[PDB]
Every structure is written in C-alpha cells, then in structure tokens.
Amino acid sequence: ISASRKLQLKTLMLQIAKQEMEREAEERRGEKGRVLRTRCQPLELDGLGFEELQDLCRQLHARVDKVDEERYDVEAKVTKNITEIADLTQKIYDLRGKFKRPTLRRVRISADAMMQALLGTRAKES
Amino acid sequence: IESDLERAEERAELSEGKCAELEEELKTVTNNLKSLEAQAEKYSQKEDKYEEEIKVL
Amino acid sequence: IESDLERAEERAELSEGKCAELEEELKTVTNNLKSLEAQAEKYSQKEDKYEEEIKVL
Amino acid sequence: GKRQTEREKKKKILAERRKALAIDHLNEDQLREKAKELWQSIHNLEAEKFDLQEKFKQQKYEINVLRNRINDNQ
Amino acid sequence: TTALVCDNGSGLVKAGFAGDDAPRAVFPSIVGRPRHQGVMVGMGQKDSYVGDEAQSKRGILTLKYPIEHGIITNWDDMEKIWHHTFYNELRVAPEEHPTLLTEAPLNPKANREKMTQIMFETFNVPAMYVAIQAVLSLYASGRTTGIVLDSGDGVTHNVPIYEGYALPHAIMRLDLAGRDLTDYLMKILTERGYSFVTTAEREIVRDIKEKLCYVALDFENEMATAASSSSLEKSYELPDGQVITIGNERFRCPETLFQPSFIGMESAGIHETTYNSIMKCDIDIRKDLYANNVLSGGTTMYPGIADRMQKEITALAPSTMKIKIIAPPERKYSVWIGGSILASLSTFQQMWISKQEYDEAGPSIVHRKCF
Amino acid sequence: TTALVCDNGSGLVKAGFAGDDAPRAVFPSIVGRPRHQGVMVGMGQKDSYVGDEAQSKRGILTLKYPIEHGIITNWDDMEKIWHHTFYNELRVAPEEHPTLLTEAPLNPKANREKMTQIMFETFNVPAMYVAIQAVLSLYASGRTTGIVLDSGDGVTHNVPIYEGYALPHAIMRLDLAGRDLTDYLMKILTERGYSFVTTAEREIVRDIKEKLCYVALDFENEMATAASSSSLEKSYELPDGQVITIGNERFRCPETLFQPSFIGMESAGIHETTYNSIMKCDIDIRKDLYANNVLSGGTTMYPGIADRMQKEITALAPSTMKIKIIAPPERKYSVWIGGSILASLSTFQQMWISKQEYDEAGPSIVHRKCF
Amino acid sequence: DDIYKAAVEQLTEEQKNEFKAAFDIFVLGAEDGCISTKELGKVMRMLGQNPTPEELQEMIDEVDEDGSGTVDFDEFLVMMVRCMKDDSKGKSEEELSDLFRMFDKNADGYIDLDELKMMLQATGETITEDDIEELMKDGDKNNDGRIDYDEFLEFMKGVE
Ligand SMILES: Nc1ncnc2c1ncn2[C@@H]1O[C@H](COP(=O)(O)OP(=O)(O)O)[C@@H](O)[C@H]1O
Numbered sequence A: 001i002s003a004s005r006k007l008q009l010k011t012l013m014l015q016i017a018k019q020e021m022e023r024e025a026e027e028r029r030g031e032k033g034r035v036l037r038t039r040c041q042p043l044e045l046d047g048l049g050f051e052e053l054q055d056l057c058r059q060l061h062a063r064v065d066k067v068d069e070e071r072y073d074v075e076a077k078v079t080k081n082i083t084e085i086a087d088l089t090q091k092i093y094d095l096r097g098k099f100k101r102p103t104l105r106r107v108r109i110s111a112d113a114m115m116q117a118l119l120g121t122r123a124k125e126s
Numbered sequence B, C: 001i002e003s004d005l006e007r008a009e010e011r012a013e014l015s016e017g018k019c020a021e022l023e024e025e026l027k028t029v030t031n032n033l034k035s036l037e038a039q040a041e042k043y044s045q046k047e048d049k050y051e052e053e054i055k056v057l
Numbered sequence D: 001g002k003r004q005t006e007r008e009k010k011k012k013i014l015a016e017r018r019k020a021l022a023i024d025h026l027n028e029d030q031l032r033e034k035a036k037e038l039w040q041s042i043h044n045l046e047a048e049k050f051d052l053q054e055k056f057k058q059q060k061y062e063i064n065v066l067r068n069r070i071n072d073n074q
Numbered sequence E, F: 001t002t003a004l005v006c007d008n009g010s011g012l013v014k015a016g017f018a019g020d021d022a023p024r025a026v027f028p029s030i031v032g033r034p035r036h037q038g039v040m041v042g043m044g045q046k047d048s049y050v051g052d053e054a055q056s057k058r059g060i061l062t063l064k065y066p067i068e069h070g071i072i073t074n075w076d077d078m079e080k081i082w083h084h085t086f087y088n089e090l091r092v093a094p095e096e097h098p099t100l101l102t103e104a105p106l107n108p109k110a111n112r113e114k115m116t117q118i119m120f121e122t123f124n125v126p127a128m129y130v131a132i133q134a135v136l137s138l139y140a141s142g143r144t145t146g147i148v149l150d151s152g153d154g155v156t157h158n159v160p161i162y163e164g165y166a167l168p169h170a171i172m173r174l175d176l177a178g179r180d181l182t183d184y185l186m187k188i189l190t191e192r193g194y195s196f197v198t199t200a201e202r203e204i205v206r207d208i209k210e211k212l213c214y215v216a217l218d219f220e221n222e223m224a225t226a227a228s229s230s231s232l233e234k235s236y237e238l239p240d241g242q243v244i245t246i247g248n249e250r251f252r253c254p255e256t257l258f259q260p261s262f263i264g265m266e267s268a269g270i271h272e273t274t275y276n277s278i279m280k281c282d283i284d285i286r287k288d289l290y291a292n293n294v295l296s297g298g299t300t301m302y303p304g305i306a307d308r309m310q311k312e313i314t315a316l317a318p319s320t321m322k323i324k325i326i327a328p329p330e331r332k333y334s335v336w337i338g339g340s341i342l343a344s345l346s347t348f349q350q351m352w353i354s355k356q357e358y359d360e361a362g363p364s365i366v367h368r369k370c371f
Numbered sequence G: 001d002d003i004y005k006a007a008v009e010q011l012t013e014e015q016k017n018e019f020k021a022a023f024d025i026f027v028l029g030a031e032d033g034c035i036s037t038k039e040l041g042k043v044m045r046m047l048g049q050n051p052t053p054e055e056l057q058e059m060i061d062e063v064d065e066d067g068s069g070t071v072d073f074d075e076f077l078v079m080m081v082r083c084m085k086d087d088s089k090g091k092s093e094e095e096l097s098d099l100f101r102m103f104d105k106n107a108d109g110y111i112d113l114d115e116l117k118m119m120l121q122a123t124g125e126t127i128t129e130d131d132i133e134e135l136m137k138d139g140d141k142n143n144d145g146r147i148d149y150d151e152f153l154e155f156m157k158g159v160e
C-alpha cells in the first residue's frame, strides 16, 4: 500500500534473513568445533617413557606436515577460486556497467543544510 | 518508435509460424527416411542371399 | 516503448535463427531421402537381374 | 620450466613447513609438551583446511551464480 | 578533491566540476579590445573584455576568437580566457584541482604541448589530462560502440569506435563547421539588401542562424516551394528595430553541410564522410556502426537534421542494414557530460599526468603513455 | 568417475563426457589478440579471446589457429585453448577426470610427448590416453573392418583396418584438407571482384564454402553447363549486405580434393589414394575393404561426394568387386562418438597411462606399450 | 534520514502539521492540497541563492513512484529519507550475497518461485497475489521464473 510500509516490510524481511544467516553461522561454528574434536586424535600422553613419546611426536609431525600440505593445496585452490570470482565479477560488471556511472549533481543541496541555513538551529532532526 | 515496435512484433509472429511449419516438415521427412532405410536393409539381405546362391550354382 | 521495441527485435531475431536452422535440417534430410530412393530403384533392378541369373545358371 | 618449478617450489615450501623436530635433548615431560604443540598445530591445520572447504564451496556457488547470470546475459 | 572538467571548444567555453549534469558556466570565447578613443575620465575602462562581458559591450569592441579551427592561434588571448574561466566564472584557484581539457582529433602537436605547458607553469594545476572530443560524446550516450559525428563550431570530425577500441585509420576530420555556416549566411543575406560587415554584427548573424535556419528534408522541393508560395518567410527583429524577412535563406545556410561546394570546399558533405568513415572499417563491425550512429556538437541542433542525415545514409548504405541516428536532446553539452562521467570514474583516477612526471620528461609527456 | 573425451582437431574442438551421443561443447579453436589501440577506459577488455567468443568480436581481432596441419605449432595458445575447454565450456576441474586425446597418424613424436607432458604437469589429470583419429571413426560405425578416409580440416589420412588388426604399412596421409579448400575458394573468388584478405574474412569465406559449395558428379559436364545456362548461380548475403553471386566457383572449390593439382600439390586425389591404400594391403582382404569403405571427418560433408567417390573407385577397381561407401549422417562427430564408445568400454579401462607410470618413465611413456 | 524519523517515531503526523505551519510561514495558500513541493523550495531559493529547480523536480518526483499516482504521508517520509541517504543499499552488498546464498540452498544460481515463496513465508509477510506478482516481476525482470544475483539485487535495490 504505502511506500514506507513496503520499505518497512523489506526491512523486516532483511532482519529475518540476517537472523537465518546468523543461524547458519552458529551451525557452521558448531560443526567446526565438532569436526575439529573428531578429526584431531587426542593427546594420549599418560604413563609413557621417553622413546614411545619420541615416536609419537615424530609421527605427529609427519601427519602435521601432511595436513599442512593438504590445507596448502586447498588454500591454493581457494585463491584460484577467489581470483576467478573477482575476474568474472569484473566481466559481468563490464557486461553490466557502462551507463551505471553515478550521474549525481552537487547543485542538489542537502535538505538538512538548507533547513539549518534558513532557520538557524531550529532544524534539529535534519 | 511505436510504429517500429509494432512492425517488429508482427515479424516475430510470422517467423514463429514459419518455424512451426518447418518442424512439421522435418518430422515427416525423418519418418519417411527411416522407412526407406529399413527397405534398403531388406534389399541388402536379398542381395546377399542371391549372391550366395549364384556362387553355389 | 523503446525497451518494448528492443524486446520485440530480439524475439524476432531468435525466431529467424531457429527458422534458418530448421531449413538447413530439412534440406539435408530431403537430400538423404532422394539418394535412398534412387538406391532402392537400382536395387530392385539388380534383384530382378540376379533372379534371372539364378534361373539361367 | 615452471610447472616442474611449481612442483619443486611446492615440495620445498612443504619441507620448510616441516620443522626440525628434536626431543632427544628433552625430558619426557618436555616430550609430552612438544606432542601437545604438534597436536595443536595439526588442529590449526584442520581448522584452516575446513574453513578453506567452506569458502571453496562458497566460491563454487558464486561461480554457479555467475554462470547463471552469464546465461541471462546470453 | 573534485576535478575541473574544462572544455575549450571554439565558440563557447563550457566548464564545471566533475560529477554534475550540466556545465556550471557557459560563455562565448571572445576577447575584444576597445577600438574608439574614450573621453570620459575615471569611467573604469578596462583594456580587454573577455567572455560574456564582451557580448554586452560589443557595440564598441572588436571581438576576435582566439581559436580558429580547433587549433589555437593566439596564445596570450587563450591564456586570458582560461584565467577568466578559472577565477571569475568558477572562483576556484587551480592550485587545488585537476583539469581535463579536450582536443579535436588530428590537431598539431605543438598546440597540445603548449596547452599542457601553460596549465602546468602558469596556472600550476596538480595534474591535467587531454582527451579526444569524440570519445567523451560517446561516453555521454552510455554506449560503448558507434560512430560519432561531432560537428562543433570550429571543426567537424567523425571518429568510429567499436567495443572500446578506437580505429585510428578511419577518422575523417573536415574543417566545415558552424563558423563557416555563419559566414555563408552573412554572405547570402546580402541578396536581399541586408549588409552585415562588422565583427560585432557577425554575432547578430549567428543569432539569426540559430533562431531561424533549419535543414530541409529534400532540397529541390523546398527550393521550388519557397519560390512560389510565401509560407516560409519568417521575420526577425534586429537589435534596433527594422525587422528583416528571411526567405529561402532559411534552409540554404545549413544545406552547406551536405554540399560543401557552396562555400567552395571540394570535399563531400557530412552525409557522405560518415559513410566513407564506416567503409574504411572492417567488414564485420559495419552493422553495429550503422545501427549506432551518434550525433553530437552544437551545429547538429538544426531542426530536421536527424531525418535528412538518416535519409541520405539509407540511400547510400545497403538496403538490408538498419540505419539509426542517435540524437539526444542534450546534444550541445554532450561532450562535457561525457567529460564529467570520465573524470568521475575510479578506474581513470591513475591516468592523470602528475606534475612530477611532467618535471621529469618535459611537455612532450602528453604524447607518451599518458595520452 | 567419468572420462573426458576431448578431441583437439584442427578447426573445431569437440569435447564432452564419455558415454553420450554428441559432444557437449563444440567451438572453433582460434585465439585472437586485439590489434587496435582501444580508447574506452574500464571497458574490461581482455588480452586474448579464445573459442567461440572470438568469433563474435572478430571484427577487431587477428584470429590465428594454434594447430596448422595436425601438428601443434604454438604451444602457449594450445594450452590456453585446453584451459578454456576444461574450465568454461565443461566446468569440470581436470584433477578428477581421465582424458582421451586424439592425434592424427604419422605425426611428429615431440608433439605427442609435449601433449602428454602438458596434460600431466599443468592440468594434472589422473590419467590420459592418446588414440589415432581413424580407429575411433571406425568404432562409431559399429564395424570391425574397413578402410576409413578421415578428411578433417587440417589433414586427410586413410587408415585401413581388417578384423581389428591395423595395417601400419598402408597408411596414406595427405595434407590437403578443409583449410586449403578455404584458401583456394578465397583465391578463386577474386575472379569476380570479391576480395577477402583479412584473417577475419577467412571465416566469411569458410561460411560461403560450407553453405554453397558442392561436389560435382562429373566435372567437365558441370563446367560446360555452368558456362551456358545460369541455373547454378546461387547468391549469398555478406555480414553487411552487398549480396554476392557464386557461379561455377561452387563445384570448383571442392573439386580440389580429387585433383590436387589445382593448388599445385603433386599427389593424387582422395579418390586414388584410397585405391592405392587398398592395393598395398594383402590380396585376400581387398574385397572386404572394397565393400566397407568408410567416410568421416568434416570435409566429407559436401553434398554429392559419396557418389563421386564411389564412381571414381568403381572406375579404378576391378569390375567384379562391389564398392560401397558408408556415409553416416553424423559424419562430423563420428570421431568423437567413437571416442566416447571406446572410453566407455570395460576392457579398455586398464590401458590408461596412470600418473605413477609417467613419473617413473617420463613423457616418453606414450610411445611404449601404453600406446 | 532514518535518524530523523526514528527520533520522531514516538510522535504522530503532527510533524507534518509543523511542516504545514512552516510552509504557511512562507508559502501559505496551497491550491491543490496535493503533492506540490517545488513552490516552497523555489520561494526558499528566491531569497538570494543560485536558482536550481532541478532539486525541486527531484524532491517532487521522489514521492510518486508506486505508479498509482498517490503521494501519501508515508510517501513524504520516503522522499525525506531518500533525498539524503546515509544507511542505504541494505548496508553491505556482501550481506546481500550471503542472503542470496541462503535463498539458493540448491546452489543452482537461480532463485525460483519456490525459493522466494518460502523466503516470504519465513518472513510471513501478508502481500496480495497481485502484489506477489508485482514483487516477482520486480525480482524476475525478464519474467521467466528464475532470479539470478542481479535480479535479486534489483528486487532488493534500495531495500534495507
Ligand atoms: N540551437 C542551435 N541551433 C543551430 N545552431 C546552433 C544552436 N546552438 C549552437 N549552434 C551553433 O553551434 C555553435 C556552438 O557549437 P559548440 O558545440 O559550442 O562548439 P564547441 O564544440 O566549440 O563547443 C554556435 O557557434 C552556433 O553556430
């Protein structure tokens, strides 16, 4: 009905979508904690002499280097993906830019400034 | 601009009608071609048998 | 009205492109039909000749 | 040339990431502390890799969206 | 800070800050010294009235344009015009503002180098950039292809562009423009008895041309009609009375554009140099150039030119191609609007010729990478 | 997982997943850098348009094929083409898919070794296999014998096969193909006045050749008929109008296949190199090869070639043998359909060149048992 | 923009009563009783500044966009908050991309009728099927049942 009414409705829709995205982030962080506790085999460090501790630490470093390599490869892939996303965003913008340059004129005085100039200080909202 | 738009839309309608007719023709000719392909295969089998009998004779 | 004209133009262009493609397809398939019909006629003649050869031999 | 150089650089970077693990001069308590360090490092790598998975999936989705927008442009 | 989008032009200087819709100050570019003696003492008489002030005291001045055909022939007067434009019409010191001049295609190098040297030494701007007057007019239309015919007051040039790649071998620059039409109108008015000779009366003839002349759709039919009926004779009141009646001089003055043989020029009209400029382009971008022909510049404001030109090109061009002529209502300021848009871009912000660069390579920097 | 059946070809790259009927993405293999200067800023102009994108902006590009005659002459451009094919036309990362390239017979070794080295190092595929372009075309016909004439766009080769045993001493590779026919057509069009020179206009001449040219059943009779009547002159509309009329250039362009003396080549036509390829085979499999002559490749799509070739071979061959020419309607994609069938086989699943094998023997693994 | 209305949110239409009183202080004597704001701004200008009625046209056009021709008090509020915009564009367009991803749980890159319908149902907004189709075509500009990122931005353009 009213333009302000539809704008308020869109604002409420934005709030709903923001809450749903916050719910998504909460799910993401919870699953992050779950998977981090699951994948990482605990520190079973009870009643061990020196030598088995050395063996365990060496195998830990080996697996650390392995997973570092895996995460490094995934990071390279993600960098490639984001570079592609940026380049194709530029491509789409080239397909959908051009005229979209902001044709804005400074002869348009801000209403608050005009109100203050004409009325001194009795334009307190604006 | 309005006159040009009207003429363009009329052209588009005519082209759509032509496309429908072409689709009909294509399907009909495709069916006929399949039938004649089967006929030619029968011809080939007949020729094979005749050739074999000629060799035997 | 200018936006309307642009939409009409693009619709007409797409329709004409499809029409051209259908024309090409029909041409090809009709040529195939003609060739196969000629082959079938020759095959009937060859079959009659082969039967005559069978009888005489 | 460069692809072979890419492999060489990759494996050298991984080797640099391999830290000199030395515990033979440490008491077994220090050994357990080092093991805790190694497990925490592996946990960090797991978290980083999972975040990379999530962001990679996000990037794939945005790539699909870009393809759809291109289809609209076509 | 904001950039100053100046546009020297030849006949009207148009300037204003980047990012607006219309130039802030538009005024003729004439500098006129007084010519009589002067007897009143203490009247405060200056030695040179520039800009719009000399269009009000033109009765006792000798106005002389400092820009003949795109090129600048009198550097002191041009410096005076720029100084006036910066200090009195915009009131912004140039020490704190980048500038974006405009220049016609195929102009002498020395003109451009002197322009940049003046802007960097006298006015001492932070950074200035020179752009071709047709690319801006293509910016303003919001296109990215098209062949633009920018018939100014000094020189008419026709730059074809495709997909952002300008075609330097297809620029056809012709020196017939509004000034020659003013002179030809002033020359054919003498056939009825009205003689305008003084350089001040050239302004009156220019006003007559602007307010009355129009381009005929078909020339011979109009010549036949104006010679039988009297439905065309429109009258006009001089600055002192004594109304005048213009007969078939109305459509004969701007017809010179399509038949430059009237003023003795050999070349072909603006209807055929566009087709020639198109035909020099490659065979695969001719359809797009045919469909996106752009008009700009002041002189293309004659009532009825966007139809005559389309009829002529349709006669010349192959029958299948569609010929469309883009004639925006804001034709006169199209170049300046495009200049504002270009100066407002973020991608363009690193193309300015910074002052330290000029200090290292001299004025010849303009021909280098920073074009 | 599924295998990627790529097929480099020369003129059209055809690719798609194994197990389908038609290639998913078919696009010309051309990489064209822009050649003009470019004045619009921020237009997003790339440095090289590849594939089907450069067939729409060809008005301001300089298209150049990266594959001349089967062999690859410009490895960087070929790598660019492959990267485009994998990432934008199929959108499947190559890290998770085997690939099955195709290669003409009798090609230089270095080409094949470089191809496998690229596929294993840059794109990092799991396993790739290279197959001869004629065996696949024999797969697609569902035969197991027959002599296949695969007249592509780069090179025409004629591989005879019997009972699955290829005859390596009877392969007759001839370098006349569609590209030379395009050049010859472009050269004989000049006899009427139409001059095509630019590398972009070669595409227009190719379109003319595809849409109008046909192979004459008898050459002299057609030359006599076209010189008296005018029932052959078919017209065609250029990309800008100005229709052209092709007379006896229609059947003279593809006649070069049967008389390579037209373009100065010494060798005999495709009608006689097939008979020579047959006669090199053993005396007991000549009847089967006569009866199962297979046509493939794009250039064998001329209307009326399957009759001219049969007439010629029947003239050459002994009178008793039956000459039959298999010309499936899906001729153009025959090689790729055969490639899909071969990649979909279970028996073939252990012939791929696994990556660990390449790591142990280097790129020279392709010439070894894994052919 | 939003600050002015928010600080006047607890108050009723009497803001417009004060606006009318202030106009009567300058431009008393309205004839239409309908939308006419060029006159008051022009009278403000005539006090000595540079003439510019383009601002008057902008402000008098910012009110009527619904296409029904009406200019409500709420439309006046929209015009006032839109003549100077501070917290606009729904803040971050990255958040817009996140919300579009939330819409496309199928990750297909096209928001369908089902996606928008379920999003509205989650918001639960009661909009008529006429307005439902209106908003759809606001999103689905080409009206093909699919909405890409650009169409979603168009639909949520100026939405915060
Ligand atoms: N409304 C008009 N009708 C006809 N001619 C005009 C009109 N306005 C300007 N002109 C002509 O155009 C010239 C102004 O052209 P302009 O575009 O200002 O040149 P420049 O490119 O130097 O700025 C004037 O000299 C006048 O002769």
Ligand SMILES: Nc1ncnc2c1ncn2[C@@H]1O[C@H](COP(=O)(O)OP(=O)(O)O)[C@@H](O)[C@H]1O
Pocket (backbone or CB within 6 Å): F008, F009, F010, F011, F012, F013, F151, F152, F153, F154, F178, F179, F182, F206, F209, F210, F211, F297, F298, F299, F301, F302, F332
């Ligand atoms: N319908 C057709 N009629 C005539 N010639 C064609 C036709 N289609 C393609 N050609 C020719 O064949 C070539 C394409 O051959 P193709 O089989 O794609 O080569 P490749 O073996 O490299 O894939 C084109 O260059 C064209 O000259």
Ligand SMILES: [Ca+2]
Pocket (backbone or CB within 6 Å): G103, G104, G105, G106, G107, G108, G109, G110, G111, G112, G115
């Ligand atoms: Ca979706």
Ligand SMILES: [Ca+2]
Pocket (backbone or CB within 6 Å): G139, G140, G141, G142, G143, G144, G145, G146, G147, G148, G151
């Ligand atoms: Ca849509």
Ligand SMILES: [Mg+2]
Pocket (backbone or CB within 6 Å): E009, E010, E133, E150, E152, E153, E297, E298, E335
């Ligand atoms: Mg100009």
Ligand SMILES: [Mg+2]
Pocket (backbone or CB within 6 Å): F009, F010, F133, F150, F152, F153, F297, F298, F335
């Ligand atoms: Mg091939």
